[PDB]
Design a protein around this ligand. Structure first.
Ligand code: MG
Length: 219
């Protein structure tokens, strides 16, 4: 058994959500009576939701307008997840996670979604039965890019950081993993290009989730 850990981002890594996040963010803003530049939305995609919506609304994060928006987003996104079911996931995700488990890797999710939303997504997609630990942005005091979430789930897995790899599509994932003393496999099919992820400290970048699985399996 490998007795190693794999710490997986959700949005843009396991779940093919970036396009839907942008759309639904726009739907929420319109519901809230406003709109923002396309590029502003795109810069937030997959980042923590209250902070992102507060930035887009241009208001303090504690402003009641933010909780109104986050609640509306939860309704719309929840409906999207029921419409997608397992097709929320990229091809080969469940199979790849099962192969990592078969090889004795212990699996966790570290997402910028809130934990309850992460759990619900895990349940609707089938990730839940592959993952030993799930953490989201509100599971820890300091979310991405801080190491804390990765350190927290590694402890839950019983694997030290030196034996964990972070897999993600975002600069915050790469920063989180490096800060935590972990290896990082960037993926290029989500919100970031390969050069950005390299420059953020990814040890390698791959172009598909099966390719990330292969990288881990082959050491
Ligand atoms: Mg992501």
């Amino acid at each position: 058994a490998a007795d190693r850990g794999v710490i997986l981002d959700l949005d843009g890594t396991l779940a093919d959500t970036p396009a839907a996040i942008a759309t639904i963010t726009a739907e929420v803003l319109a519901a809230m009576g406003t709109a923002v530049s396309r590029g502003a939305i795109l810069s937030t995609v997959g980042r923590p939701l209250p902070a992102s919506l507060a930035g887009l609304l241009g208001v303090p994060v504690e402003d009641p307008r933010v909780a109104e928006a986050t609640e509306e987003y939860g309704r719309r996104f929840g409906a999207h997840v029921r419409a997608a079911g397992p097709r929320l996931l990229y091809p080969g995700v469940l199979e790849g996670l099962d192969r990592l488990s078969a090889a004795g890797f212990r699996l966790a999710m570290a997402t910028s979604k809130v934990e309850k939303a992460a759990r619900a997504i895990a349940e609707l997609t089938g990730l839940d039965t592959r993952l030993t630990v799930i953490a989201g942005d509100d599971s820890v005091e300091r979310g991405k890019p801080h190491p804390d979430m990765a350190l927290h789930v590694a402890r839950g897995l019983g694997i030290p950081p030196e034996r964990c790899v972070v897999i993600g599509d975002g600069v915050p994932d790469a920063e989180m993993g490096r800060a935590a003393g972990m290896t990082v496999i960037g993926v290029s099919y989500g919100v970031s290009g390969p050069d950005e992820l390299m420059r953020a400290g990814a040890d390698t970048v791959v172009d598909s989730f099966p390719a990330a699985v292969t990288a881990v399996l082959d050491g």
